[PDB]
Each structure stands twice: as C-alpha cells, then as structure tokens.
Amino acid sequence: APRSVDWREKGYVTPVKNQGQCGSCWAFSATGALEGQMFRKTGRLISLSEQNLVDCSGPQGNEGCNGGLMDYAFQYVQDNGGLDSEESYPYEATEESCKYNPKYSVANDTGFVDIPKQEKALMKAVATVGPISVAIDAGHESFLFYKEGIYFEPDCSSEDMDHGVLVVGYGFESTESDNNKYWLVKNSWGEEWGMGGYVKMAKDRRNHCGIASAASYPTV
Numbered sequence: 623a624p625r626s627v628d629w630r631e632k633g634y635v636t637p638v639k640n641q642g643q644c645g646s647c648w649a650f651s652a653t654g655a656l657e658g659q660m661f662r663k664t665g666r667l668i669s670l671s672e673q674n675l676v677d678c679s680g681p682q683g684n685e686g687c688n689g690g691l692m693d694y695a696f697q698y699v700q701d702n703g704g705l706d707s708e709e710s711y712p713y714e715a716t717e718e719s720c721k722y723n724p725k726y727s728v729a730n731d732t733g734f735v736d737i738p739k740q741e742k743a744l745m746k747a748v749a750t751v752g753p754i755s756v757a758i759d760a761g762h763e764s765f766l767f768y769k770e771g772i773y774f775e776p777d778c779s780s781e782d783m784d785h786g787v788l789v790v791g792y793g794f795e796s797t798e799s800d801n802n803k804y805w806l807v808k809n810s811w812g813e814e815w816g817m818g819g820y821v822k823m824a825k826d827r828r829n830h831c832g833i834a835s836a837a838s839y840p841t842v
C-alpha cells in the first residue's frame with residue numbers, strides 16, 4: 623500500500639464540526655464516511671444531516687444524543703431509502719421529532735462493510751476505499767487535552783471504545799521515536815481541538831485505543 627494517505631487533499635472530507643452537548647459522535651462518524659463514499663461515486667461533496675440520523679435512527683438501535691453505532695446509521699440510510707443534506711435538515715445538538723423529507727435526500731447506501739479487526743486490514747481499506755468510520759477509546763484526559771503530535775495513551779483500551787470518529791489517512795512521522803506511525807483521525811469537537819479538529823493516533827502499536835476493533839464503511 624502507499625506510505626501515506628490523506629483523503630482531505632483529494633476532496634473527500636467536509637469541514638470539522640462541533641457536536642456540542644449532544645452525544646452524537648457516531649452520527650458525525652457516519653456522515654463523514656458516507657460523504658466520502660458519495661464523493662467517490664459521484665464526484666460531488668455534500669454535507670449530510672447528522673440531525674436526520676439523531677432524530678430518525680432509533681428503530682435501527684440508535685439512542686440519539688445518548689449514543690449510537692455507525693453501522694446502525696448506515697442501516698437506517700439503507701432502510702429509509704435516503705438521508706437529507708445538512709442544508710435541508712440542519713444540526714441542533716438535541717433530540718427532536720423525525721422530519722426526514724425524501725425529496726431532499728442527497729445520499730443512499732446499500733449496506734456496509736465491517737473491516738477485519740486488524741490494523742493491516744484497516745490500512746489497506748483506508749488506502750483504497752476512502753475515509754473509514756472507527757471506534758476508539760476517547761475516555762482519557764490525555765485525549766480531552768490533545769493539542770498536537772502522535773497520540774499514545776498507555777491506559778487506552780482496545781475493547782472499551784466509547785467514541786466514533788473518522789480515519790481519513792495514515793503516515794509515518796520522522797520524530798526519531800518509537801511513536802512514528804499514525805492514523806489521521808477527524809474528530810467532531812470543533813477546529814479549535816487538536817490539530818484543526820484532527821488527531822494523529824498511534825498506528826501499529828497493538829490496536830491502540832481499539833481503532834481497528836470496529837471499523838466500517840457504507841457501500842453505495
């Protein structure tokens with residue numbers, strides 16, 4: 623595979639948002655992956671409605687501002703026959719009545735692929751598919767207050783992931799350390815957090831923070 627990947631340079635990735643006080647990380651992860659695959663399909667980048675997912679995907683198992691799964695969001699889009707744009711169904715950072723309108727749907731999916739649970743498979747998916755939804759353990763102060771560089775938290779769990787984010791690339795950073803390989807990860811805590819809203823997460827260090835434990839993307 624390529625020595626490094628960054629899908630932002632190729633037009634696959636919308637701006638970073640701030641999810642606010644709503645536990646909608648999973649919705650931003652899901653829209654990010656679908657934004658990427660819709661772009662691959664059509665050559666058009668359109669910001670999708672997280673609010674549509676928050677309000678409408680309870681029947682697939684999601685829990686609005688108390689959390690959810692990206693694969694449940696992909697299942698909703700398939701079941702529903704569509705997903706509205708941000709413009710037509712803007713973000714409120716609350717749980718509201720479903721107001722999905724099919725005329726304003728700008729995306730679809732045909733299911734989703736769960737990537738085998740190894741960092742090598744994740745790399746090869748990132749290299750070829752586009753941005754990938756992933757689960758991480760974000761429950762450490764070191765992550766809350768990350769600013770820059772390659773993130774490594776010795777207390778990170780590879781199983782207790784609690785935050786959905788989007789891998790948009792990977793690389794090898796020459797720091798002359800045991801912490802050179804990274805995943806390039808889009809968060810939903812605004813541009814002021816980390817490196818313009820992004821974090822470089824330790825790669826090939828025994829599935830650090832569970833980044834390869836629940837990786838997936840929608841098929842379109």
Ligand SMILES: *C(=N)C1(NC(=O)[C@@H]2C[C@@H](S(=O)(=O)c3ccccc3Cl)CN2C(=O)C2(c3ccc(C(F)(F)F)cc3)CC2)CC1
Pocket residue numbers: 644645646647648683684685687688689690691692693694756757758783784785786787836
């Ligand atoms: C985001 N603001 C926040 N986190 C979540 O909703 C996260 C997102 C996923 S995950 O990426 O952590 C994950 C974990 C394990 C397997 C697959 C995935 Cl995608 C889930 N989650 C959780 O915190 C989690 C959870 C939450 C809700 C549900 C539901 F039933 F579907 F609603 C399942 C699992 C504990 C794992 C903080 C809210």
